[PDB]
Amino acid sequence: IVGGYTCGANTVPYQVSLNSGYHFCGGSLINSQWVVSAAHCYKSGIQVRLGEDNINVVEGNEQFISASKSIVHPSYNSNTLNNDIMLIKLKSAASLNSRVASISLPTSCASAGTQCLISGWGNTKSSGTSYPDVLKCLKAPILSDSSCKSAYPGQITSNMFCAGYLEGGKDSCQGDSGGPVVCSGKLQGIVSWGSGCAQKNKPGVYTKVCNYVSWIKQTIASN
Ligand SMILES: COc1cc(C)c(S(=O)(=O)N[C@@H](CC(=O)O)C(=O)N[C@H](Cc2ccc(C(=N)N)cc2)C(=O)N2CCCCC2)c(C)c1C
Numbered sequence: 001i002v003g004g005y006t007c008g009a010n011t012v013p014y015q016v017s018l019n020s021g022y023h024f025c026g027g028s029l030i031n032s033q034w035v036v037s038a039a040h041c042y043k044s045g046i047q048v049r050l051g052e053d054n055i056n057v058v059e060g061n062e063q064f065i066s067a068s069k070s071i072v073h074p075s076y077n078s079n080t081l082n083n084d085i086m087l088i089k090l091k092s093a094a095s096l097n098s099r100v101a102s103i104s105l106p107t108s109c110a111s112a113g114t115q116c117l118i119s120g121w122g123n124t125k126s127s128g129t130s131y132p133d134v135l136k137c138l139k140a141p142i143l144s145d146s147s148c149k150s151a152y153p154g155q156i157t158s159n160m161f162c163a164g165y166l167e168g169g170k171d172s173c174q175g176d177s178g179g180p181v182v183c184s185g186k187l188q189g190i191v192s193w194g195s196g197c198a199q200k201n202k203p204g205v206y207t208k209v210c211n212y213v214s215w216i217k218q219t220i221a222s223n
């Protein structure tokens, strides 16, 4: 997260860290046994880490649970990043408490102008590299489809939305992939892609979760 602030230990209870020997992506806990992330975060041998703040220190509120199954959206296109969403099932159910809680799926799509909370352990520099060990947060509004399409000519599909600042300086970044974008207490987006990080006129592009609620519900119900 570039231009954000330190969330604070366990203030974002639904945030998960996907670990394969190291943190490679973020994700959101939607229920005791399912995690939603970006399809571009797909990898084998994923261990889901919950209750994390400092990912390099055991602080006492963590739950490390291996994934039993990963399901990448049936129409995921790795070249256009369209349908960049994936579901991960845990081998065992997480113990839900105040520090490890699930985020609700939306019943409707958030409109432009809505303020959202984005979080992750990704790079904090727009030029250069510096990964934080503790969770970073960023408040950012959803941009209109027009400004989004104008910033990214011919790349925005109906399954994507822009959020951030056209001025640049604040944005999600490498390592935040798969992370949550919460608006009105619901999971509305998934950190997907962008032209670099925090670049002027190049806001973050997020997977529009409200379009996948049916697929998510159906999948969970049969797996
Ligand atoms: C389809 O292939 C693509 C697509 C894009 C748009 C890019 S990019 O412009 O460099 N943008 C990168 C930026 C970067 O890697 O630093 C990106 O979107 N990366 C995301 C991570 C990310 C997400 C959001 C933001 C942001 N809000 N600005 C920045 C970075 C990523 O890891 N993947 C996996 C690899 C494929 C691209 C997406 C690249 C290199 C490839 C190969």
Ligand SMILES: [Ca+2]
Binding pocket: 052, 053, 054, 055, 056, 057, 058, 059, 062
């Ligand atoms: Ca830790």
